[PDB]
Design a binder for this molecule. Structure first.
Ligand code: SF4
Ligand code: SF4
Lengths: 420, 415, 421, 414
């Protein structure tokens, strides 16, 4: 047992929900207790969604345990199917149901539905949310994708966008627009926006864009072996990262790299004279692996900060992060304990903190400028306005967003220093 | 056309969209300044507490969860040993905690983790400075506000004994509301009155065969039973929502204590007028409007009672996660006899009834709110009713305001 | 003499510099003393521009006054023509130069340059910045635009966008998008992005979109006479005003309204349950007339606030604003005096204040939530990111921007209360 | 190799990109607690102050501008009465003000309102609580820092008479810098020393025939002239920038007061080594780099001296708005012999020379800076140098740091 107040990630079954809600015409059935429906709040409140998550629970409680739990799962599965007629379903165990002896795969197969029901294995006591989504998506893809003839014109898939992703919506839109400038159309984007029938059409794409390693890497690896599809290793957050990405995409396809830079403003903003006081500002960077690595390169090589501390909460990105951090002369902080983050921040004494919502709060207490680069994140960071982190508009967005807190902090510090 | 005493209540089972009792810790701990709440459960439980607490999570709250690890799943010798180390470590960090609650969850229950026995052990090892209790807040056992009930019940048998004739007001109320309650009871001449729970562990009520208690909250079934086990007698009353609810509640106390009609009518006259005036500023928008309430907290029956009688609303289906007949008798007698009563839910069946009724206003949780608003149904989210000051005279207009607002916004935003 | 600390607007000649700097291939020559080049810092630092403004000063000082001041103006017109070979030029007086006896018209008529040189009358002791801009553009359009053969396709002009304009850059882009969606291409956008040659070709457009009345109306009125082009009277800020705008353009052109709303998220955002606490929240709105009028309709009819005060510093907009405020049962505050704003705010005790950079500061002192909706503005409100106030993306932007400080305010208040009120 | 005493300076007029003397108010009023600076000018003058002040405008600062209206453009009599109305209003609105400066602008001077006469008249009227002065900050008369010069010069006639032989350190400095100066001079055995301006109106220094003064800022020509008219005698010294300048500045004072070489070396040893170690950190990116300086503040020559001799920079064109030949002698004698010097400015021509030279680092105004960056020239905005602490030992590394930063940002980003 670890005493826990804050947790950066929920249980893997929430990640499964994160993949189901992302998709359409797919029902997820979770074996779990009355009460676990609280996770729907996340999708309806934070993402401001117009429908109930395609998720339901067997809903066992004290007066229906023992041999009744198996029946409830069967009821739940049959009821979900008869009501929504999805193209496919998935079944999984909540943490509480993981201690029961019920076999979802056995139960679901004996029910013998006219659509595939994909049983998921999600160890709720050793693994967390991001694995839940990654594994759910891999299992879905393994069950549904088949080798196919390549489309006549060059296309790719987008992999790893989910519900409750930090800026996934607008990243998808922005990455689409920059592949379209190179003459590459998107085949399927998945999980987000995909149906199980779309998943069946994955194989006709030429390669995959792996947008988020934490939620798409397994499906990408599978699609590489099964559908002979290469996947991009570089995540286009940052001007520099976007170029390398497009260079990678060029190597994959043989197509030349074309760009529309008429709207790229970050490099000139950063080169301009009003940015020269940012030079050497000490930045501490925390969050998930993908966003921390991306932010570090922007901080050091695009804005001119000194990266003074670097880490992430998700074990699955530990090695890419440790490899990244060493180029800055730093040892990566790998932890899911916000109190450890708080110790590393005090010791590093930064001038700016790039992090999650926990870090915004640590930064408030210490009186330090902070900006948010990664999930977990409250309702504020699901904006009505266009807010990508990726590509060129994302580079513009990131610039305004990191700099704003610094100007506010200096401005408030100057105001109090000339009153008396 | 008032009275649902003999009304057939639907006893419904199936898919549920409700919070577990763990949720109650969030606003319970704020009241018991001296206590800590340690859930023994999974990351799921931790995630829930985080979600329900929202911003409070950043304010060093006096709760937390011992997340069960894989090693804790294989052997019960190790787990009781780990819990002890985890407690001692927690109590050393926070010397000012006087009451520790070990809160049972679905995972700790399935595991057959004996938290009753752990509470006794830890209570031995940490006396006299910290008393430690045990109760369940699991989804298996408990819905949302029933978590407060199990909590208070767990601490009733440990309370001092007394032969004094005193009043206990049961239910954690917001501080300003409690103060008003106390003032009104003092003005009425009702001798020493204590709340359960008290603001601090060293001023908890005593109980004996002459104790009287009245409930400020409808969800207090087990606490009621435990106080009666100790010898106390309940004063039956409708719940103190609105001018009438509050008057009837006070009246029942007054009558129990032999307070004269002259004294009652004069102590109560001005706050009664105040509250009536504040409700009337919400009638235009509320009168003739139809109400549907999903099950969440057990407040829905008395709130529906207030909405129909004092706000001229029309009830359709009013559902509660639990319907305790004796405790709800006074309010049930006041509800419009047309009211369809439900205890429990099969979520999909209830939404089908809801879609057919096509109610003007729908009380439901955050899981259903936006989905319902997208289908054109005006909604008021339930959870706000548990944590906003709503009881008694001074909050009667604000109580009504909570329901007029969603209907006024709807009208503003579309012609 | 008015005792002045804060000024919402600068002198008219900065308005002239706003028009010159928006444009290409135009030199603006100003008769003024050494030292008035400080205004160059506004275009270079704030708008983050990568060239010196096309603006030069005669640079007179104490040792060379008298009959030398005319010589100096002559030299600067000559030097600016010889170095930048502009398509056209403008000449005007600084406030100090207005006290002198030199006639900018006669000096430049005598110089007899191979391009048009447009003289500008700018009353620097009675009029301000916006007027400077509105007049300068009007004079340039009077000088250059001619009756013309209409284009085969339905086209229009965008009128009023300038340098130092609050969100002019992205407003132009968004308006262009919503017109293209109706199959209406833009002919010329002026002043912002245009050349004197571009200005000659204004008349061939079917109609005019008046984006900002403060800096475009006078030119629009001229083009209504000279080239028979009617102009849009609705500013597309807010969902409703955008629809009223597109409807208006329908009447003018005969084309049906076609919208793309696949990305319009503001209406669902404010209808969603999270926005319910926003109802009845008391807002005080201040800025230039256009943005105050637009903001108030959004506040009341789209987000569900109660508008509790309205005003503008922009006297040219006094009437439309007074008329609009009456609809909300308010008396419009017309003032250039930040101290008056501060009093009105205090007397109204709002929960949100919408305004200028000055209103940001008044708000902070009072600890009230605040968002910026209008110039004058500091560096940040000239963003690298896409940031329109207009059209459908404007509506999304406006929603996030107004709501964020309220949720910050509620969040701050909640956790000071949580530990330990 | 190091003499510029006899270098022929190019004097130029024409198009200028410089600030007027009004700008000086922004950091002057911060020093003089009791003071209020009322400009008499147009909306342009108020707009400049607003831009120059930035966020300080929202800090209720002790300046403002009586902006001229139509009515005020004619004629004298009525305008003067109107000024009094505003001044009387201002004084009761802020009663803790003991010094009022009527600052002349270009508009006021063309209009020929006699602010000197208004000051006289208002002094009589608001005596004894408020003394009122007048000086010019106009673009017609004055460039940027010269506004401090005319301000202090306007105070000198009225300072108290004394026969004591005390030191006056002239020029507004950041309090942190002032304190250091005081401490070093005090531990050298030099006292008492006073500042002009002082922090409050009631502790302004006295002058008389036995007074000695030393300038901390190069732009103090009229002030020097005024103090000499009252009989005070100047101590000549190069300006206290970097280890060398500060030492030399301090040495001139210690020589004047008979302090021994033994004391000088002991008090000065640790701060000296400390200063030259802080500078060394910046020696990496600065050595060998060419320097070009547009005219702004009259700090350019001392600063170029510091950058060449202590930071290993090569000089090219070093321009200044005004060059006082006597005051600048010590620093001119230390500048490298190759330096092209320019007094005044003719912008287009000076931008042609700049382009031809292609210097590594250019000090210039914000109005030039970005446009020059876009053309691939590393720049350093000048205005920062007048408000940041830069004089004396403790700040020598920071000063070097002001010039190394833009160069290491250019390297870092490409
Ligand atoms: S329903 Fe059970 S498992 Fe789920 S959060 Fe509540 S106590 Fe934990
Ligand atoms: S240069 Fe003259 S007119 Fe311009 S701001 Fe300075 S004093 Fe005023």
């Amino acid at each position: 047992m670890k005493l826990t107040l804050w947790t950066y990630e929920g249980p893997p079954h929430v990640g499964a929900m994160r993949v189901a809600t992302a998709m359409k015409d797919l029902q997820l059935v979770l074996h779990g207790p009355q009460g676990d429906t609280y996770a729907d709040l996340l999708f309806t409140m934070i993402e401001r969604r117009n429908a109930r998550p395609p998720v339901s629970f067997s809903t066992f409680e004290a007066s229906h345990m023992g041999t009744d739990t198996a029946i409830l799962l069967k009821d739940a599965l049959a009821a979900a199917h008869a009501r929504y007629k999805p193209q496919a379903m998935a079944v999984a165990l909540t943490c509480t149901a993981e201690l029961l002896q019920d076999d979802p795969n056995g139960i679901s197969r004996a029910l013998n539905l006219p659509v595939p029901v994909v049983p998921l294995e999600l160890p709720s006591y050793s693994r967390k949310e991001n694995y839940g989504a990654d594994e759910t998506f891999r299992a879905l893809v393994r069950a549904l994708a088949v080798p196919m003839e390549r489309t006549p014109e060059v296309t790719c898939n987008l992999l790893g966008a989910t519900a409750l992703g930090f800026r996934h919506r607008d990243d998808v839109a922005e990455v689409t627009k920059l592949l379209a400038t190179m003459g590459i159309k998107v085949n399927v984007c998945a999980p987000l926006g995909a149906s199980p029938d779309d998943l069946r059409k994955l194989g006709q794409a030429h390669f995959n864009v792996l947008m988020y390693p934490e939620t798409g890497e397994s499906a990408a690896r599978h699609l590489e072996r099964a559908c002979k599809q290469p996947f991009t290793k570089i995540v286009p957050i940052g001007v520099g990262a976007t170029r390398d990405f497009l260079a990678e995409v060029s190597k994959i396809t043989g197509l030349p790299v074309v760009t529309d830079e008429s709207t790229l403003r970050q490099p000139w903003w950063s080169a301009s004279v009003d940015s020269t006081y940012l030079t050497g500002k000490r930045v501490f960077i925390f969050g998930d692996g993908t966003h921390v690595i991306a932010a570090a390169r922007i901080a050091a090589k695009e804005v001119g900060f000194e990266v003074v501390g670097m880490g992430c909460y998700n074990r699955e990105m530990a090695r890419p992060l440790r490899t990244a951090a060493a180029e800055y002369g730093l040892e990566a902080l790998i932890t899911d304990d916000y109190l450890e983050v708080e110790k590393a921040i005090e010791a590093a004494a930064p001038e700016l903190i790039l992090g999650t919502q926990m870090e915004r709060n640590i930064a408030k207490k210490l009186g330090l400028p902070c900006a948010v680069i990664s999930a977990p994140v409250h309702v504020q960071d699901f904006p009505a306005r266009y807010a990508p982190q990726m590509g060129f508009e994302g580079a513009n967005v990131l610039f305004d967003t990191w700099v704003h807190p610094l100007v506010m902090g200096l401005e408030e510090h100057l105001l109090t220093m000339f009153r008396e | 056309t008032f009275g649902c005493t003999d009304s057939p209540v639907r006893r419904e089972r199936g898919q549920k969209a409700v919070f577990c009792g763990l949720t109650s810790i969030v606003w319970l701990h704020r009241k018991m300044q001296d206590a800590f709440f340690l859930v023994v459960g999974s990351r799921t439980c931790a995630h829930l507490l985080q979600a329900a607490a929202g911003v409070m999570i950043f304010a060093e709250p006096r709760f937390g969860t011992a997340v069960l690890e894989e090693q804790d799943l294989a052997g019960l010798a190790d787990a009781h040993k780990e819990l002890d180390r985890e407690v001692a470590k927690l109590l050393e960090r926070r010397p000012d905690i006087r009451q520790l609650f070990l809160v049972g969850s679905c995972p700790s229950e399935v595991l057959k983790l004996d938290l009753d026995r752990a509470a006794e052990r830890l209570s031995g090892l940490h006396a006299p400075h910290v008393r430690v209790y045990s109760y369940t807040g699991s989804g298996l056992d408990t819905t949302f506000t029933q978590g407060e009930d199990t909590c208070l019940a767990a601490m009733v048998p440990t309370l001092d004994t007394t032969e004094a004739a005193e009043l206990i007001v049961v239910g954690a109320l917001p501080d300003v509301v409690e103060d008003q309650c106390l003032s009104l009871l003092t003005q009425l001449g009702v001798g020493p009155v204590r709340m359960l729970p008290a603001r601090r562990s060293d001023i908890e009520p005593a109980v004996g065969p002459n104790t009287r208690f009245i409930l400020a909250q409808p969800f207090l079934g087990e606490t009621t039973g435990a106080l009666e086990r100790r010898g106390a007698k309940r004063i039956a009353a409708p719940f103190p929502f609105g001018e009438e609810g509050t008057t009837l509640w006070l009246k029942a106390v007054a009558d129990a204590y032999g307070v004269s009609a002259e004294k009652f009518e004069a102590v109560t006259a001005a706050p009664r007028a105040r509250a009536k005036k504040a409700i009337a500023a919400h009638l235009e928008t509320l009168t003739g409007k139809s109400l549907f309430m999903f099950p969440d907290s057990q407040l829905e029956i008395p709130l529906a009672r207030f909405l129909a009688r004092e706000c001229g609303m029309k009830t359709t289906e009013i559902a509660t996660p639990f319907l305790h007949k004796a405790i709800m008798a006074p309010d049930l007698a006041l509800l419009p006899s047309n009211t369809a009563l439900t205890e429990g839910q099969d979520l999909e069946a209830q939404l089908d009834r809801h879609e057919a009724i096509n109610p003007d206003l729908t009380v439901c949780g955050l899981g259903l709110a936006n989905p319902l608003e997208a289908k054109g149904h005006a909604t008021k989210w339930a959870i706000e009713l548990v944590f906003t000051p709503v009881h008694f005279y001074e909050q009667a207009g604000d109580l009504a305001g909570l329901f007029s607002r969603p209907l006024r916004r709807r009208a503003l935003l579309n012609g």
